Design a protein around this ligand. Structure first.
Ligand SMILES: CCOc1ccc(C(C)=O)cc1NC(=O)c1cc(NC(C)=O)cc(NC(=O)c2ccco2)c1
Length: 115
């Protein structure tokens, strides 16, 4: 019912590492979207709440996820943002879908273990 921050981090960190391990698929996701650098100035006309792997990793490393579902919700925020902004035929959309497939495989045994 109640989780300790370090045990939560140890349970969840391998699922995040499995996303970082996807290369090149995780590359658009390893740092916050920079619309200036990427040439996509409408990004924040479309995406309300940005999220990326580096932000999730810091929240995990500083104990900000006190329930497993808060971690999962940030991962899916990252996915949903990319599916929302990018065309279904685009690199980032396809890479996002690959990451979601990987995550779905990795997170299920972990959540079964945690609750
Ligand atoms: C041009 C529009 O870019 C985007 C548009 C939208 C979104 C989102 C998340 O909604 C993300 C991006 N970012 C990328 O596509 C992107 C960014 C970086 N690195 C940096 C630091 O920006 C690297 C790569 N490299 C490869 O994907 C790659 C390399 C080799 C094979 O594949 C791609």
């Amino acid at each position: 019912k109640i989780f300790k921050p370090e045990e939560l981090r140890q349970a969840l960190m391998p699922t995040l590492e499995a996303l970082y391990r996807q290369d090149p698929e995780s590359l658009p996701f390893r740092q916050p979207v920079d619309p200036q650098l990427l040439g996509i100035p409408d990004y924040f006309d479309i995406v309300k709440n940005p999220m990326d792997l580096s932000t999730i990793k810091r929240k995990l490393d500083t104990g900000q996820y006190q329930e497993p579902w808060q971690y999962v919700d940030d991962v899916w925020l990252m996915f949903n943002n990319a599916w929302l902004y990018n065309r279904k035929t685009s690199r980032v959309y396809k890479f996002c879908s690959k990451l979601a497939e990987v995550f779905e495989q990795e997170i299920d045994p972990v959540m079964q273990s945690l609750g």
